[PDB]
A and B are shown apart, each in its own frame.
Chain A
Amino acid sequence: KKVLTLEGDLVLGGLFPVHQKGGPAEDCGPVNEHRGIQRLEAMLFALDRINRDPHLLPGVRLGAHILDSCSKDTHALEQALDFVRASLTAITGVIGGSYSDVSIQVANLLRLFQIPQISYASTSAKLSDKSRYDYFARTVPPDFFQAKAMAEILRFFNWTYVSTVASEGDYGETGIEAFELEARARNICVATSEKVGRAMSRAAFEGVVRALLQKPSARVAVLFTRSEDARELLAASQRLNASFTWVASDGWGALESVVAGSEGAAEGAITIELASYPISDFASYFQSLDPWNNSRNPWFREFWEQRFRCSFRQRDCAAHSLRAVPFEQESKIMFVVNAVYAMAHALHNMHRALCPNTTRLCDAMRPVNGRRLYKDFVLNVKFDAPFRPADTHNEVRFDRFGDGIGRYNIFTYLRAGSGRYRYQKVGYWAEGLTLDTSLIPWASPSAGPLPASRCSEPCLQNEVKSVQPGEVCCWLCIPCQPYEYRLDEFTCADCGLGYWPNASLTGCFELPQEYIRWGDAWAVGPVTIACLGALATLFVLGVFVRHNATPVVKASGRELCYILLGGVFLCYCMTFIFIAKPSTAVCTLRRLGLGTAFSVCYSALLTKTNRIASQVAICLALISGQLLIVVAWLVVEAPGTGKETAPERREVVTLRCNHRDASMLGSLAYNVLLIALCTLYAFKTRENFNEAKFIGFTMYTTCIIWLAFLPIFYVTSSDYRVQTTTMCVSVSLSGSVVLGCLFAPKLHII
């Protein structure tokens, strides 16, 4: 147990983490070179400067009673016991407390004796409560703003799925709770929450690293641990070949050789450190320190032997010095200087307000009471920084909770010369996040893809539902109803598709599709048959007109021949109307004309049998009788609208005439009349031998043409492609051959 004591009228206490905590066999081991020794020397330098300042305490010399906490709260309490043992050298206030737990324990011990305490590194938000710490001051921002800064940093890079690890105690717990609260305020999810204990072993660190690696969707790790815990975690990650994007708090900071002892595991780590400026006077004072003239520091020999490895009492540690080697100031040095100067200013104000005549300690101040000082001068103090740069405006003041202003800096640990790893500032945080993306060599587009961390990757808009129970960390999207249009929520479709399947896959469109109607792309065959029939009947009609019905046409009556020409002519035209799109003006003719097409052909055969002028007129009127049934059916069949869609194969609409569905009923009635007329003539006659034989061929041809339609009808069954329209063309085309066969030998030999 070493102690650093100096003489003076007023003695100020001190607590610094000079030594790092060891294992079970030793309370504390290696010397903390940057965070304990440099801070102790900064406090000593501040005290020396105050002791030579005429304006600040001209007649009062400030003493020092500084102790080493060995980075333990129990050891810190054991050391601070002698601070209050004298009260039962009196202590008017301690400038000490680097770790949050140490500061909390010291404040708890000191609140029973009314001893003010000003911290220089403790940033825990638990110390901001003035109900439990009535005499605790602090010159650093609390973690309440550091949590906001880290949450904003995570939100900036779309880091909505991260893993968190914090050290057990008083700093890690409050910080991680605040970070979780601020991440729930925004849209950030937490994957894994690990803890680091005080007696944490290497195997436990490996287990924590494995647990962190167990979540491949969270490539960003949020750190709220201490310096030693961060170093051990980095070593464990390095020895396990684990790569992570570390986002750490001020516990890591910009420590170059302390935490980043394994260069390579943390190459894109983002660290947040309290804003500070270098002090040239402190650098000059520290660079001139030697182990010979600095006899007032009991721990300087150990620091020398550690940073400049050699052996004392052997003529070995007498060549090197602190000037030639590079020197880097600790970030939390100006905070220690400000705390010491604030304590000195409070003491000076108390002396001025209590001893208005003498410049030394008058009898009214010799018992120093902490309550009055803390309530009057410690909290209500305002002065410029003792060693601030020329181009700045910084004031040392305490808020209502005795804290500092929430200003932070953002650092990244990059490599400059392929091995020269260093910390480079990339932004700051006072009220909002102002980051420099171009200064970070893993976020620029030229440096490669941005490392993102999401629980679920965003799937394509098409065939996605993103089912989410209330508010959930991440979503799962599944294809749903390919006939639905689109949706971005739990429901499969935001709008009703209706009879039109899906949409253009860009949202709610509900665009209509083509109906059952189709252009004559593959209907050339029906058209070709019509042209062949028209060409065949053109020559048949041409010879009849040229011969003036003299040779054979005027055999008996010369009337059936004229009527027969009309029947074949209208049969060819039936193919054209059937292959057209059903509309309000053309769809009505197909149903009415179907019965008439068979009636005219059958009438000619019936008229010939009846004959074997007036008869032709009677036959023409007889054919009109069958057309009356078509007109009667057309009373309701002519207006036809609707569709015959089915809950299958939604790509087709299947919209046609209402009479088209009823065309089967209409066709059945028409076919009945034609069949009966044809068979009666053939059997009755079974005149001229040639005429009688010719009638037999025509009578059988008409029946066989209609008979062959039945097997074809079952084949199609309204298939909408080569459908019942095809066989209607074929039977009409076959009927043209039937009509041609009647007159085929009439003029063949002429």
Chain B
Amino acid sequence: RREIKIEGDLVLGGLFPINEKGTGTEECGRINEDRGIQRLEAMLFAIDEINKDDYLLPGVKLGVHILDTCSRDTYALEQSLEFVRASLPLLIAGVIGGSYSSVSIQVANLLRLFQIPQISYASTSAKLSDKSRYDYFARTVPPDFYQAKAMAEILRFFNWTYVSTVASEGDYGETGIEAFEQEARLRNICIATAEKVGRSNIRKSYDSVIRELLQKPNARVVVLFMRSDDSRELIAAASRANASFTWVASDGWGAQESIIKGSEHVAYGAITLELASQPVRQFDRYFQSLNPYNNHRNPWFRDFWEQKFQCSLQNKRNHRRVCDKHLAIDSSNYEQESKIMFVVNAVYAMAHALHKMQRTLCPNTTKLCDAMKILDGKKLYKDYLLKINFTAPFNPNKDADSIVKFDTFGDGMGRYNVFNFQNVGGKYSYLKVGHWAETLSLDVNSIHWSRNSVPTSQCSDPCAPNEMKNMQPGDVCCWICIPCEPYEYLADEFTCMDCGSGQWPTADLTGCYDLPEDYIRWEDAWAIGPVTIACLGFMCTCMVVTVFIKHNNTPLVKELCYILLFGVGLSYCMTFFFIAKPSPVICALRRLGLGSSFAICYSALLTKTNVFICLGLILVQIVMVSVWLILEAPGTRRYTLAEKRETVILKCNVKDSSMLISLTYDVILVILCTVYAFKTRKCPENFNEAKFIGFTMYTTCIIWLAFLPIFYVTSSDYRVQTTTMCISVSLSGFVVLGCLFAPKVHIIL
């Protein structure tokens, strides 16, 4: 039974993890040098300072009854029975111990049955904030509620929306990881895997956790809520698998340079959080002057000396060469622990609470009067401990952050320091790269990352909106971008839909433009051909115009011939109207013009077969003006739900079949009557032109066989329909020119 028992008027309990967990077979093995010895000596240093003070408990000596918890709650509970043995043996006014959350909770469950106030220096579990279960409990450190929120902001700062969580079973890891999940949901942070390590774990068990973390390579960031010993095994396990992770740990890791023993390659680039605290200058001198020969009140100091310095003291030669006794704790090998001022504040908080209690229950005497002979834990905690307010004992700032006080839940103020593990100057060390005081403020300009830059931890590759549309498979963190049809634009991010028929998506696909491409063109490859024949044929009409009055009386042909010459002129310009790209109002003129061109030419030819002649020809064209009269302004686009989706052509789609039917009926009637009427009746005039006009009439039926029959099939194309129209019309006009060729050649010859 190793313990520290200093006599005094008032005895304060103590619970520190001097010894670590141990390898199962033993209750506790190796000495915890940083978090078990420095904290233990910090309490002794604070007690000596209090006993030397005149304004804090004058004339009353403070004793200590410090016990070792061996970093386990089962062994701590047995030790904690000594604090309550007298109440069932020294009288304990209060307990300053409690480092692990599991240890503190188990002790608090027993201390509340005997009304013993307890102040913790390292337990940050949010479960201890409940004042209905742990009535007599207080702490100088904030709960894990703020710590879990602080790391969530860090993940959001780097947009690490796909991370993994590794925790440890107990009152700290399980409670802390629960708060992290709640904070992660509000920031759209998704968890890949959730692994938990146990108290009774082997190296193979730890490698199983590492292998599970490697099953999802997209999650390069691991969030750790573990104890000091549990984190050491996982880092060592990760060193045997050549696995690199971005470690984001809680205060369990902190800036402790004892977890990383020969495993700095995997822990490099880690982001660890440590509570905001300042080193105590007075404690630095006190700890660097302790020796195994002069320090006799600490039974664990000799074991600490034989481990840190690896020299024997019992027989002076047990493990290595004799201890030279010329070595001592110095700044070369000594670094002050982070949670040192918290231990000092916890000791001073109990001392100050008793000082206020002593000045009330003992109004006159400066010693322990009869009123305080039987201390009441309920009055000390609720009336004096919870309403305490004093400045830090050893503080160099004297700011508002140096005030030691407890809130309504008996906790501290949330202030965390962000640390980064990096290799600078050839050695491995920590460095503060941020601070969290109700607001995140990092120092990314001086952060050394893991491989060469900020790691990317996202579930899904972020797909550009050029052709890909996000589709959630049922979750809110991962998604799959399956492209949709190229003629549909995405609305904002998740839905691509068609904006009706006849539109094309924009360059950014945030909207859809109207289809600009059109099949109409001017002076193109498909239009130069038909127009070339048309102009030459049109100029041929002018040749007949030239021989109008120069040779009129001399020829015996003489105005039916002149009427048909002007009639076929409308056919020539009809070809030019057909090839015109726009059709705002001329499409109705095209059917009226080209349709009447055949009627005038055929009627004039029929008239020649047989004043009055002009009236009959005009009568046929008179009724052709109002055949349809159903307007021509709107042209329906031929684009539909076809594969093209990129071209629009109107071509005056209104009344397309009506023109063909009317033309066919008129053409069929004229050819039958004209051929029958002429035949071979008498062969009058200079030459037998009665058969000649029949030849022209017969050829026009073949030309009529190119108007209707070859059309209505494959004529839906804009280019094909126009080219076929002018060729058929121009061929008919050229045929009529052949009829007038014979009178023309007779004059020449």
The answer, among A24, A78, A108, A715, for a CB contact under 8 Å with B77, is: A108
A105→B109 contact, CB < 8 A: yes
Tell whether, in the assembled complex, residue A112 and residue B471 are in contact, meaning their CB atoms are under 8 Å apart: no
Once the chains bind, are A711 and B710 in contact (CB under 8 Å)? yes
Chain A residues near B81 (CB, 8 Å)? 112
Whether A715 pairs with B473 at a CB distance below 8 angstroms is no
Least Cβ–Cβ distance between B515 and chain A, in angstroms: 21
Query: Quick one: which of A451-489 are within 8 Å of B by CB?
Result: 455-456, 467, 469-470, 472-476, 478
Chain A residues with CB under 8 A of B216: 470
In the bound complex, residues from chain A placing their C-beta under 8 Å from that of B106 are: 108
Q: How far is the CB of B726 from the nearest CB of chain A, in Å?
A: 13
Of the residues B78, B133, B480, B713, contact of A715 by C-beta under 8 Å: B713
Contact B77 A472 (CB under 8 A): no
Interface assignment of B262: CB less than 8 Å from any CB of chain A: no
Contacts of B727 in A (CB 8 A): 711
Structural contact, B113 and A81, CB atoms closer than 8 A: yes
**Nearest CB of A to B529, in Å:** 12
B480 close to A476 (CB less than 8 A):
yes
A132 close to B (CB within 8 Å): yes
Q: Does A313 contact B (CB under 8 A)?
A: no
Query: Which residues does chain A contribute within 8 Å of B112, judged by CB atoms?
Result: 74
B629 in contact (CB, < 8 A)? no
CA distance A456 to B706 in the complex (A): 62
Instruction: Name, among B77, B132, B474, B727, the residue most crowded by chain A CB atoms within 10 Å (CB to CB).
Output: B474
Say whether B109 contacts A474, CB under 8 Å: no
Report A377-414 CB contacts with B as 1/0, cut-off 8 Å: 00000000000000000000000000000000000000
Interface residue? B91 (CB, 8 A): no
Chain B residues within 8 Å of A81, by CB: 113
Type the 1/0 row for B677-717, where 1 means its CB is closer than 8 Å to any CB of A.
00000000000000000000000001000100010011000
- Which of B78, B133, B706 has a CB less than 8 Å from the CB of A74? B133
B423 at the interface (CB under 8 A from A): no
Give Cα distance in the complex from A456 to B112, angstroms: 52
B343 to chain A, nearest CB (A): 27
Interface size class of A (residues with CB under 8 A): 20 to 34
B527 close to A (CB within 8 Å): no
- What residues on B are CB-neighbors of A613 within 8 Å? none
Q: Judge whether B88 is part of the interface by a CB distance below 8 angstroms.
A: yes
Q: Is A447 an interface residue when CB atoms closer than 8 A count as contact?
A: no
Interface centre among A109, A199, A469, by most chain B C-beta atoms within 10 angstroms, is A469
| CB atoms of B474 and A455 under 8 A apart | yes
Q: Is A234 interfacial (CB 8 A cutoff)?
A: no
Contact yes or no, B471 A476, CB < 8 A: yes
Collect the chain B residues with CB atoms within 8 Å of residue A473's CB. Answer: 474-475
Residues of B within 8 Å of A, CB-based: how many?
32
Interface string of A45-84 (1 = CB under 8 A from B): 0000000000000000000000000000010011001000
Please name the residue on chain B nearest to A719 by beta carbon: B714
Which chain B residues border A712 with CB–CB below 8 Å? 710
Q: Are B113 and A112 in contact (CB-based, < 8 A)?
A: no
User: Given the complex of chains A and B, what is the CA–CA distance between A512 and B74 in angstroms?
Assistant: 77
B88 near A88 with CB under 8 A, answer yes
Contact with B along A82-126 (1 / 0, CB 8 A): 000100100000000000000001001101100000000000000
Does A311 count as interface, using CB distance less than 8 angstroms? no
**Known contacts A78-B113, A81-B113, A476 near B474 by CB under 8 Å:** yes
Cβ-defined contact, A467 with B473, below 8 A: yes
Asked if A314 CB lies within 8 Å of chain B CBs, one says no
Q: Contacts A473-B474, A475-B473; is A131 near B200 (CB within 8 Å)?
A: yes
Cross-chain contact A472 with B113 (CB below 8 angstroms): no
A77 touches B474 (CB 8 A): no
CB-CB contacts below 8 Å: B149-174 with A: 174
Q: B388 an interface residue at 8 Å Cβ cutoff?
A: no
* Contact in complex: B474, A474 (CB < 8 Å): yes
Interface string of A695-716 (1 = CB under 8 A from B): 0000000001000000110111
Instruction: List chain B residues, Cβ under 8 A from A111.
Output: 74, 77
Cα A684 to Cα B232 in complex, Å, equals 113
CB contact under 8 A between A112 and B78, given known A77-B113, A473-B474, A474-B474: yes
Q: Is B482's beta carbon under 8 Å from chain A?
A: yes
Question: Per-residue 0/1 for B626-648: is the Cβ within 8 Å of any A Cβ (1 yes, 0 no)?
Answer: 00000000000000000100000
Interface pair B132/A456, CB less than 8 Å apart? no
In the assembly, what is the distance between CA of A716 and CA of B710, in Å? 11
In the complex, what residues of A have CB within 8 A of residue B329's CB?
none
CB-defined A-B contacts under 8 Å, sample of 22? A74-B109, A74-B112, A77-B109, A85-B88, A105-B109, A108-B106, A111-B74, A112-B81, A455-B474, A456-B474, A467-B482, A469-B478, A469-B480, A472-B473, A474-B473, A476-B471, A478-B471, A478-B482, A648-B643, A711-B710, A711-B724, A714-B720
Cβ-closest 4 pairs across A and B: A476-B473, A715-B714, A474-B474, A88-B88
Given contacts A77-B113, A78-B113, A478-B482, 11 further A-B contacts (CB under 8 A): A74-B109, A85-B88, A108-B77, A109-B110, A131-B200, A173-B174, A475-B473, A476-B471, A476-B473, A711-B727, A715-B720
